[PDB]
Amino acid sequence: IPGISLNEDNSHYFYTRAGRRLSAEEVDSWVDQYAGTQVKELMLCPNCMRTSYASQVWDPIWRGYDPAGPDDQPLLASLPPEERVAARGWIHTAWQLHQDGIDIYARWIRRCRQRGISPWISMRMNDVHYVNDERCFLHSEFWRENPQLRRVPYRFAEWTDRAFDYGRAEVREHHLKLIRELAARYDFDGLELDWMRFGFHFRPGYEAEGAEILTAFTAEVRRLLDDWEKRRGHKIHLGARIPSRPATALGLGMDAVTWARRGLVDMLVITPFWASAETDMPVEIWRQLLEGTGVTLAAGLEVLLRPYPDSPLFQTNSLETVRGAAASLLDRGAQRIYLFNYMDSQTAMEDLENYPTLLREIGSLETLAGKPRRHVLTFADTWAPGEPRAIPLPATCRPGEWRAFRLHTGPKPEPGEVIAALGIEGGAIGPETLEVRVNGELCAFLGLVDLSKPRPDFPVYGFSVPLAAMRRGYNLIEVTARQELRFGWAEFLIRP
Amino acid sequence: IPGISLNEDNSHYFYTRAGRRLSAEEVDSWVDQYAGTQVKELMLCPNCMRTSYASQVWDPIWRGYDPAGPDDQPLLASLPPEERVAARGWIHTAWQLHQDGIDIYARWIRRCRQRGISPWISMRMNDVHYVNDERCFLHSEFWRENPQLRRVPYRFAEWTDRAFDYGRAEVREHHLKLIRELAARYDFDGLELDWMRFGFHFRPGYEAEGAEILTAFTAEVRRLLDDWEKRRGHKIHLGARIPSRPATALGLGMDAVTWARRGLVDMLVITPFWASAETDMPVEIWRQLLEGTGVTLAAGLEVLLRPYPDSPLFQTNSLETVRGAAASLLDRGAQRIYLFNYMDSQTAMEDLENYPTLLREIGSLETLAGKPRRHVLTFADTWAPGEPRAIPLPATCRPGEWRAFRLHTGPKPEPGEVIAALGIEGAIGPETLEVRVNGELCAFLGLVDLSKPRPDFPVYGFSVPLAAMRRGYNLIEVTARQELRFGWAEFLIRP
Ligand SMILES: CC(=O)N[C@H]1[C@H]([C@H](O)[C@H](O)CO)O[C@](O)(C(=O)O)C[C@@H]1O
């Protein structure tokens, strides 16, 4: 009954369908694959710094575009030859659609309602893809002409250094112009403010004033949609994506508790940025913080699954690891599982054959129950500027020392197998090199485990967990080593 | 005004007054130094594994004691000769009080009320000092005879490994026996459950069931005190010390939000363990979590001030650093500043001459305003088992890389001087660092000669444009032209 919110990005559909002259019927058929699943809402993203539809107030993706021209034309000149082919796939498909009088978002919204899906618009509030390239096709002329409106002018270390400063009147107006058009153009059930693209909206040190500013912004949005409710003849929801921990959220100027209490939002998505999906997010704390407000709390998953920030592995979640994350987060009180970057091609799970099963299982503890799952230890990629960072992995154990790892494994396991699995980096061990306990109970050595993707590129050792040791929620791996060891991976595999 | 809660520990008074035959009058005079200050409550701790008063349900500190005997006697045999002198100071003074018919806690409670101080009892729920020594004088016989009731039987790496497991009925009963006695023996305004001595109460991995167990415990205590309200003819408060961050609190089986919502507690003290004061605690998050519950949220200071867990420096807070922490935590919404280990001698601020001034200033932003203060970067000493730890220092900056440190400096500074000061561990010039605060370039000042507490490595000062500083967090950003390791960071605000 919690169900899935699925986010469709502003570029994917155009990139993957490029080269086809799309009919209204084919455009509609994209919604259909999500019909009869646990998907309750599609969050349709129509923009980055530019829109993928023919905006009157912002730059469409195709502003500057020469449809008949060569790839080497001014709009694409800044990219290498090979990347112009991909960018032009997006620009051209978005352009051609408009030329045929097909508004892709209007069609998706209409088809959503026919298929019992609640259609949302999700706006990227501060996308900064490729801002190292000032000439790049997908920057707004407004961004290009106004470097004084940026967040960090004293350095350029990260893309977010060149993000818009929402402390400025003219930055808020620029984003409110697009919202006023989206509300007028599209008859959506809900608007989501996607603050987590890229989650950095304020001069470093100005986040507290930023918090009062985004609350007022959110209130302007809520007021505007209230007017549209009387016009459309139905309720319109307002939602937001925010960081995964309340202190990080408040530290980036997102006081979601105030937004909830003053009735500005009725859905909140707690999410990482992109580096890895968080398999561990303090859902129960947010639920306490949001008590009485009537806000739907969604737990946001990302497609990547990576053990630590500096890992060179860039593999996606599998059905089994999404089953783990989803079982965990629903067990903690998530009222929705929200998928970001889990699309039907290119930006999607590596085991794409499992996409339909995933959409029919991860939205309920009932449909996850008795199915194989993996609870993998990862990390929170997003922290407020100068906020101390708590990153579990990698973890050194010196001879005779103890290390502990708490992994959230949601519902108590049904009868069957539980393996605590630990990856060791740097080249190794015997059957008595490690002592492994779970909630204090000794775990028997199993030997090397042949993991399916996602998996580390170093040996993973399995330890058999006495079924009855496992408890609902967090479960504690403790390890001591007789030799210095570095851990690069931890998970629970539960196969009932 | 928010005001001060001050904790007197179970041993201090006995250790420091040892060798004097104490009169009822002198015992009473201890309360007097706190009268007419911002202290609203004295939290009088009467126990560890043993009581400092003559309990009939627990071991007094002097169980086993031979008053006329030599230092080398069975009760103290396990200590080296010179440590028996200190321990025996505590045991003998506590014993001799009882022999004179002086109940120190009954006298303190009475004298508190005469002097307009609200008197509390603060019970250590699981003290584990010196549990490496199974024959130690301060361990209870119950603890000694029941090693099966301990938290960790598979290893002994930390004192908390030999803490009692409150997952056991026998452990809960044992601690409830003392609470039943304290409620009957003493007419206190409030009982505080000091969970933060030592904050580890459950088998590793059983903290969730632990949370339901301490809620039921706390509720049992609340029901007990409700009965005593009708006998004593006045309200009795129930309070608790808990970890500084909500996730850590819930992770150690302390669901204080439930305790607050069900009206089991009406005071909560967020605090670190002992390694250092936390100058940065999520007060505003707790206030949101506690909204409508009527619970007073107290921000707990510890006496030590240390930049990171492995630092060999063990210096205390000064008047100036306590002013900084207090200005910060009050600014964030603390309804009380709570002092732990800020006593009148031995366990005390090293600038002891400033103790009376401290007790008249740190309870109100009004009395802190326009006074010199230091906002020092530290760390949270306490994390749930296997919980990822966020420790800011020490911090390496590679050539051409940026590091940031957010320090909470509470109220925006008055007219005067603001210095960002950065300590370098393990050779720099005036351009080796670029330092910004909230993006504004800060002038190199050179080496700053800090007063204690201070690192044993060079501290460089950077002049902050007064107007850059904001209310609450303020952001130091630094880039280095040479590989450097920071061991220290602070704001000095001198109006
Ligand atoms: C690289 C690619 O093809 N698509 C990517 C898009 C585009 O970069 C973006 O939509 C341009 O506006 O961004 C994401 O959705 C994102 O932000 O997480 C990830 C996705 O993989």
Ligand SMILES: CC(=O)N[C@H]1[C@H]([C@H](O)[C@H](O)CO)O[C@](O)(C(=O)O)C[C@@H]1O
């Ligand atoms: C002289 C001395 O060491 N006293 C210390 C006492 C005793 O060790 C304890 O009361 C034994 O029961 O403990 C503390 O208050 C504590 O827990 O932080 C600190 C204080 O410095």
